[PDB]
Assembly symmetry: D2
Homo-oligomer: 436 residues x 4
């Protein structure tokens, strides 16, 4: 009838390293008003920081970047071949943001320049926004507050709903989708999610096989997808046709993923009761007045005349929490690459690291040798280092570039200069630093 047998095998934080210095104080340039957390991390390392609140014109940048060891940018400052080619001293680039398209990664890598970003530091800020907007759409808060500001009193309960017992449809169950799932359940929503992949539910959310089943059974539909050919305009006339009468659409994902004119048709036809958009096919480049208009997007005027539409200026990760933790994530990443040669989490460089050295390891030196990925190079380097015990050593390749880290013992101030000069003279060399 059965037997008692072995259960299936299941499936805290607690409280001395050597401070390494380069043979060459380092100079950091921070643009586009990076958070003060980044600034404090860099100053506490001894580094000299130059801080600006704006991007710089191509002219002043080329002048500034000549003598700089690390630069922090956001989405606005373009680092092209044109401007990176004058960067004699540049060790690494910090992108205090998710995007890296504003940097010529291929070129940066070929000069031995490591690039870091913060891809996931914004998840919580977007999830909270969507909760706020579910409630705000449910209750038509925006409309109520606009009315009373113009002096109109319109106390309405009709089609104004409580969120408890309603269905949230999450399209894309990723970093943000999943954090949202848990908040939504805590606010008493049933969570369905469609994804092109099978994913393990958090809490008591249920994965649905087709988009059509989600749109059919959902009161609120929210999008948390990347920009791909398949996500392009993936919500359009036929999707809105498949949704419940008086259902709600929220998009804080990508400007392209929803067909705004179809949305506008659906809202006009009383099929969709509300929408919140944080992202649009075309967005201003700077902040300012009459930026959001029919020159930018043809339907801007038509949308601004609809009831119960929340429109936001791409502010999903626009919190002090998000900016400060981007500051820490990226300043830490640079700080460990400059101080230890740690390239883990870089988007353009081979990923390489070694355990820190004890305070007690006098006269150990760390070789950071970026080089062309061809046969013969380790032969040369390990020949040059032959007079010293290599405690340990790690090399990895990323296409046509490669990165060796080596720890060598019994090196006096004299022998360092010798080893630098020899490694500097090698055929395959792209960049060499010694940490001492």
């Amino acid at each position: 009838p059965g037997a008692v047998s072995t259960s299936p095998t299941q499936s805290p934080r607690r409280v001395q390293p050597k401070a390494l210095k380069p043979f060459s104080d380092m100079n950091i340039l921070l643009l586009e008003n990076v958070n003060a957390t980044a600034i404090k991390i860099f100053k506490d390392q001894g580094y000299q920081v130059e801080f600006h609140k704006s991007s710089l014109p191509e002219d002043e940048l080329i002048e500034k970047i000549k003598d700089v060891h690390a630069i922090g940018i956001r989405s606005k400052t373009r680092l092209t071949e044109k401007i990176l080619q004058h960067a004699r001293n540049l060790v690494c680039i910090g992108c205090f943001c998710i995007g890296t398209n504003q940097v010529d990664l291929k070129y940066a890598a070929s000069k031995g320049i490591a690039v870091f970003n913060s891809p996931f530091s914004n998840s919580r800020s977007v999830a909270e926004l969507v909760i706020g907007e579910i409630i705000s759409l449910a209750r038509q808060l925006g409309d109520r507050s606009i009315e009373l500001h113009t002096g109109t009193w319109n106390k309405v309960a009709a089609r104004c709903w409580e969120v408890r017992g309603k269905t949230l449809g999450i399209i894309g169950y990723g970093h943000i989708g999943s954090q949202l799932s848990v908040l939504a359940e805590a606010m008493g929503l049933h969570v369905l999610y469609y994804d092109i992949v099978t994913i393990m539910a958090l809490g008591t959310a249920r994965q649905v096989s087709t988009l059509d089943e989600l749109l059919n059974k959902s009161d609120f539909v929210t999008l948390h997808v990347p920009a791909t050919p398949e996500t392009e305009k993936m919500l359009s006339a036929p999707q809105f046709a498949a949704m419940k009468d008086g259902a709600y659409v929220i998009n804080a994902s990508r400007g392209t993923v929803v067909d705004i004119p179809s949305l506008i048709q659906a809202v006009k036809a009383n099929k969709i009761a509300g929408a919140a958009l944080d992202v649009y096919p075309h967005e201003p480049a700077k902040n300012g007045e009459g930026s959001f208009n029919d020159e930018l997007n043809s339907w801007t005027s038509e949308l601004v005349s609809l009831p119960n539409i929340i429109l936001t200026p791409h502010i999903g990760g626009s919190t002090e929490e998000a900016q400060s933790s981007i500051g820490i994530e990226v300043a830490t990443a640079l700080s460990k690459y400059i101080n230890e040669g740690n390239s883990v989490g870089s988007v353009n460089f081979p990923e390489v690291s070694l355990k820190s050295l004890d305070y007690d390891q006098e006269n150990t030196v760390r070789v950071l040798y970026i080089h062309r990925n061809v046969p013969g190079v380790l032969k040369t380097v390990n020949d040059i280092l032959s007079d010293h015990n290599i405690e340990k050593q790690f090399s990895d390749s990323h296409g046509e570039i490669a990165y060796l880290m080596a720890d060598i013992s019994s090196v006096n101030q004299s022998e360092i200069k010798d080893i630098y000069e020899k490694l500097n003279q090698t055929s395959a060399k792209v960049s060499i630093r010694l940490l001492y």
Copy 2:
């Protein structure tokens, strides 16, 4: 020794005799009048009882109401329809009044009670709708959503993260830890907020909230301050200049309680001085009585012009309980309450009447009759009634007094169709009688 090991200090729902369906000795079918667009849930409950329902979406003029209420057994109103002696005095048949709302002031309770007319309301069925609103507004204030959406609608793009905060790790100060305060406490903890609460009573925390001894400790340590208090002399203008002075630089004020409890001009000063970073108000010292355009202006409240000038103020027209869920559960709560008073004489939860009920009778208790005798609260009346019913075993009996009115319910066995008519006529002829119904 450092003490001794000694004694520590100290069910789920189960599906578990059918009740007897009790008919009035009134041959006439019951007539329900529902005004002011009571929810369809109420209508359904009444029709399924057999009752005849007349439904209006508006109040009625005093003329048509007096005509209509002559032959009505139960009336449902909301806050608009005033039931005064003037109009209740013509109500021959009226058993009970339903207030499908929190307020009972629209009704002359004292007068209604003296005619044996029981009044019921729904005090608490709006709690969840208010708690959800406050969560929405904490986030909306934290992120300046309203301002962002107003900007982009006029064509201004202003992407700002300065003065924008993730609610996680912030402190919610709840003033009044009642029905709404407590439901808010749980939602706030789930959204990752620390909860403090001040209350003039000691109350057991839900989740991991902590009660604080003084208002001033709450104001000092809170990022968002929300009010969930009644309108009393002590709550009148209890948030003013000195309270805002005690609050954190860049803290937020939410008032969805009573329009008297906050001094709007002091808050306007505090917002102007960059001491308060945002506010959401659902309630005001003076509110329009109808919905309309240019209702919310300086004739009604002097500061309107300045208030609506400010950044990051959410203004709402008393919409805290304005949901379909809230209205529908008001429908069930109040229609059920009337239905049990009409069918069983249950007066528990009534606001103008003694609170009296008895266990239902089993389906198989043939020839048991229930006496519902509303009467003047004076000596001798139980003596009379229990004399009139001495030829019968009283299975059980409950009488309570509320001022000058009192309410006897009695279950009596071994009564045939003959003896019912006798008992009605006798009780109907008594000196203290205000109202008698028999259920069989």
Copy 3:
């Protein structure tokens, strides 16, 4: 369409302080407590003004009859039998406290016919039984008892074979009542899947699942525990066919009733290597006192065979035998008597009509409470309400339990003079069983 959802803190009570009522013709109240009732009961009774006589033992029928002549309330446990023979001499007895679950040691029907209200504590033992079952699940899983018996005789036997970690295992709970449900939550916390069978549909706590047949439970369970009442349908409800339906190497725990398991079948199943272990707290026949040669083949024919077996925990009805349980029995039952003696509250009584009224405000000077227990016949309310008719009855509640009935009335504007009159008149009525006045 988007449509309407389906419909879905204790505080210091600032009330007007209640009025403390005293008895009228009574000088003082005498409580007799037998069978070593907890000190919590003693404290509650002394704080009420009552005079307490405390014994650690039952009393011989001789000394008891002498003692209960002049007694207002008696507290017993399971041993002291209160028969017609001994209750017939009880002139003054207002109420009986059973500081335990059982009320069979009392002649309830007789007690009721003399107007004597009986109270018990049915559910104050739940947590003590649930914890015991957790301890025993682990102890059986790991064969602790056997290991410790071995080493005490000097034998070292490190064994891992068919010793298990409870996490991942299935607890089958038969009877999802007060104990069943508390056990459910502890079991899930110790990482067990919980199934439960019950003859009623019941809402699961946590992530337990109710199963439609007993046989599904027995099939899918590693540990089967019973928390069921003693009924004709629970009698030997685990027998050969149930053990046959259980997993090879599954475990049986009975801390419910002595009759619910067939021990000869259990013994067979353990002998046939079908059942790997059992814990019994209850047996069809139990000693009456504690003693050294009590648990033997005279008491139960299979004892020598049962005690022969490996990995069987035998315990002497200690399911509820904790300091916590005894002390909270003390509070529950002493409170219940205290409120019946002081306020006439009969709610939770096992032999009387359930009747109470809201307390009176402190400032209701000259309001008196009539407690009139009487024969459930026509005309008695007529008489009483006649006797009271010179006074406003603020409120009044009468309920009937077969042939006995209980009226409580609050009456205003009564001076010390009119009290004596009203007592004497109610005392003289034909239907009267007992009358007290509180003022």
Copy 4:
């Protein structure tokens, strides 16, 4: 004035390449001391040939058996000395299916390029559950109750019998076991305090206490989850028992040495300690046996076993089917990844070295596993020998006098393999070389 301030701050996923050794005929595994069937299944599913025994082996038959063996699994009883490891031509790695490694000459094994693995933490849940069972059992005197009725005594007693809910558990050592116990104990409704020589972040709502003396003062049950160090030696003795509550309880499933049994016995005799559960004693029998636990082994045995409400267990804290089976998986997996990929992470005698697996489609990539003497010049030689191929990547680490290089090299055809093996095999510093292709 104050100021609002910044807060503090499941998916299925390129198949791997299955790498074969260059000069192997079949892999031979020897498993001793009745290793769990989970290990056996993992090895058979790799293709390996498995020989399984339920007992340790005599030194004679072992030396014969280990000549031709690629991997051996032992537990604590088998002793792998220089004497017996010196005959092991083909031995790649040793599996300790247990927490102990002292039964192995680690230093010697390392110097021959023999990697040793264990399962240090596989037992944590089994020990935590035992302590829960024993807290309840001591609280209620279950053992005594069951011993009484078995002798025919009926003794229904509630005195000094307690419910655990509302009682205080003092955990000494908030490690792998301490921390799992913390969560179970809270769920059973105990307050948890813990002392540790390190500051550690509480799970749930447990509170770390500064001194041992505060723990002993405020605790109803004291349980020990520490390693064997000079500081833990007899750390519970007369003065600690003096500091504990009248009628408190002591549980030791840590190490045989950490409690002074004489003082415990005095404290129990004086009615200061109401009960104790011991799983570990300073001296323990060597086999299971019927007269083993006595005054020859520990002078206090006859006195200890006299006492009421003392649970005595035979080191059964990690004696469950679950624990043995997950030791099976942990250690068989560890060997399997070392044999198949050269992964040495979690090894106790060898350097810790690993690389990402290779994609299925990387034909003619070869992995060099070169164990060697930790001296200058060796990487120079090896990287010279390999210089006619692109090194995709390469990792070398040293552990004292031994060191371990892993390299991935591309564009290697069936011919060039034999050349590279022979050259690496001929180098002065070489201790062991395998090629995977």
